[PDB]
Design a protein around this ligand. Structure first.
Ligand SMILES: O[C@@H]1[C@@H](O)[C@@H](O)CO[C@H]1O
Ligand SMILES: [Ca+2]
Ligand SMILES: [Ca+2]
Ligand SMILES: [Ca+2]
Ligand SMILES: [Ca+2]
Ligand SMILES: [Ca+2]
Ligand SMILES: [Ca+2]
Length: 180
């Protein structure tokens, strides 16, 4: 398990339709990842013409694509599963996520941002949640594209929604140890 300032990323493609969270999670369960990568700057897309075709995944992942384990072949539909840790002080936070299609983010195993359906690009300000103890918190994310356009940018606020930040190498850890 390598130590890096990012989340462990897995990409999965399929030629079946992804309509909701359950469909993507079942894809993840069904096989080994089509590619792995380091998710160090979680602000992906936008692009067009299906994330799972050609080099669209590379374009979507941008600054993280150089860590891809392989170049997946074509599929119609696809998505990502990210997992690891995020340093957060105790306090109150909320996500604001821009996405096409849907997604789910969990912290310490509890959902904190959910869109359980397909959608063209849309930004949701999610409800707040609490962190009870400062440190590295467990975090995971799924996102998918059913086809067409694709974008995924979760941002996080620690100040009641006045300012938001991207999750990146400043605060992410793949294993929960401090990355240097
Ligand atoms: O990206 C597409 C968008 O272009 C629209 O067709 C609605 O579904 C989304 O998945
Ligand atoms: Ca799997
Ligand atoms: Ca490809
Ligand atoms: Ca980019
Ligand atoms: Ca859970
Ligand atoms: Ca589809
Ligand atoms: Ca789409």
């Amino acid at each position: 398990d390598s130590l890096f300032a990012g989340l462990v990323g897995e990409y999965y493609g399929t030629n079946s339709q992804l309509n909701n969270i359950s469909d993507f999670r079942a894809l993840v369960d069904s096989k080994e990842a089509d590619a792995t990568f380091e998710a160090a700057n979680i602000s992906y897309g936008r692009g067009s013409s299906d994330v799972a075709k050609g080099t669209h995944l590379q374009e979507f992942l941008g600054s993280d694509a150089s860590t891809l384990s392989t170049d997946p072949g074509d599929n119609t539909d696809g998505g990502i599963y990210l997992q690891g840790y995020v340093y957060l002080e105790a306090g109150t936070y909320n996500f604001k996520v821009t996405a096409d299609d849907g997604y789910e983010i969990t912290i310490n195993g509890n959902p904190v941002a959910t869109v359980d359906n397909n959608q063209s690009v849309y930004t949701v300000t999610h409800a707040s949640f609490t962190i009870s103890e400062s440190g590295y918190q467990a975090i995971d994310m799924i996102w998918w594209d059913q086809g067409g356009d694709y974008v995924f940018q979760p941002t996080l606020s620690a100040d009641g929604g006045s300012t938001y930040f991207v999750l990146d190498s400043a605060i992410l850890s793949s294993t929960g140890e401090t990355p240097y």
